[PDB]
Design a protein around this nucleic acid. Structure first.
Ligand code: SF4
Ligand SMILES: O=P([O-])(O)O
Ligand SMILES: O=P([O-])(O)O
Length: 219
DNA sequence: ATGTTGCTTAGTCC
DNA sequence: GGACTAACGCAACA
């Protein structure tokens, strides 16, 4: 199917009852956004369809993409990520606002799970379910040369996608593994506020991941 | 009030 | 693998 079909069918997905419930349950639970409209639906990926770089996240944040409808948009992860994408020369502007004209250059964003999960922790079954969308979505990104896993969950999800063994591909920030066809699998700590605000992942460190991804992608 | 909640990683055990 | 939890730093939240 093409992207239009992907987005249409994805947005109507209700395979995970716990997530179908949670994505709506959180609406109105955060003071700053009470009364505001929430996407509260599966989150389609965003970015350059001809991207050479794929940034693969964990899942929608309750008041992030689950609210705005766009990956990493509206939360602390995006406040950290988007400016760095621009600093690396991979986007039209530093900020991401729903409905704006933000363009990503050579990069596409999505995640392992597409509906907000309780405690930001999807179950193995939920991951297995949404992996079907990963197959469809990644199939629509023919030019990707570098797959960047943001966090352990994201990495394990990509390993499953590529049929790679976890034992041979451990999660460590900066890890780099070869993929068939001269492609690359990179691992980075996730951009979550609890990684960036604690100093586990600094702006310097993540920008480096982006610059390396560009180098490996021929950009 | 100022204590609690919420935002992934690296150890433990099965 | 999968379930459980101590530990970061910060600030919205109550
Ligand atoms: S997480 Fe994925 S598979 Fe599960 S309901 Fe949402 S879109 Fe469907
Ligand atoms: O909701 P966001 O997860 O994609 O940060
Ligand atoms: O945000 P304030 O809750 O402490 O009033």
């Amino acid at each position: 199917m093409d992207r239009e079909a992907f987005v249409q069918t994805l947005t109507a997905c209700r395979l995970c009852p716990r997530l179908v419930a949670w994505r709506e349950e959180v609406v109105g639970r955060k003071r700053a956004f009470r009364g505001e409209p929430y996407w509260a639906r599966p989150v389609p990926g965003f970015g350059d369809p001809e991207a050479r770089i794929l940034l693969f996240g964990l899942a929608p944040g309750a008041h992030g993409s689950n609210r705005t409808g766009r990956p990493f948009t509206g939360d602390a992860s995006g406040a950290f990520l988007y400016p760095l994408l621009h600093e690396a020369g991979l986007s039209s502007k530093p900020e991401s606002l729903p409905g704006d004209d933000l363009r990503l250059y050579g990069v596409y964003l999505t995640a392992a799970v597409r509906c907000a999960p309780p405690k930001n922790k999807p179950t193995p079954e939920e991951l297995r379910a949404c992996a079907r969308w990963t197959e469809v979505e990644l199939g629509l990104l023919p030019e990707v040369r570098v797959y960047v896993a943001l966090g352990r969950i994201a990495l394990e999800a990509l390993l499953a996608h590529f049929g790679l063994r976890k034992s041979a591909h451990p999660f460590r920030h900066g890890a780099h593994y070869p993929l068939p066809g001269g492609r690359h699998l990179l691992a980075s700590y996730h951009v979550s506020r609890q990684n960036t605000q604690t100093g586990r992942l600094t702006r310097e460190m993540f920008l480096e991941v982006l610059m390396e991804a560009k180098r490996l992608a021929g950009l």
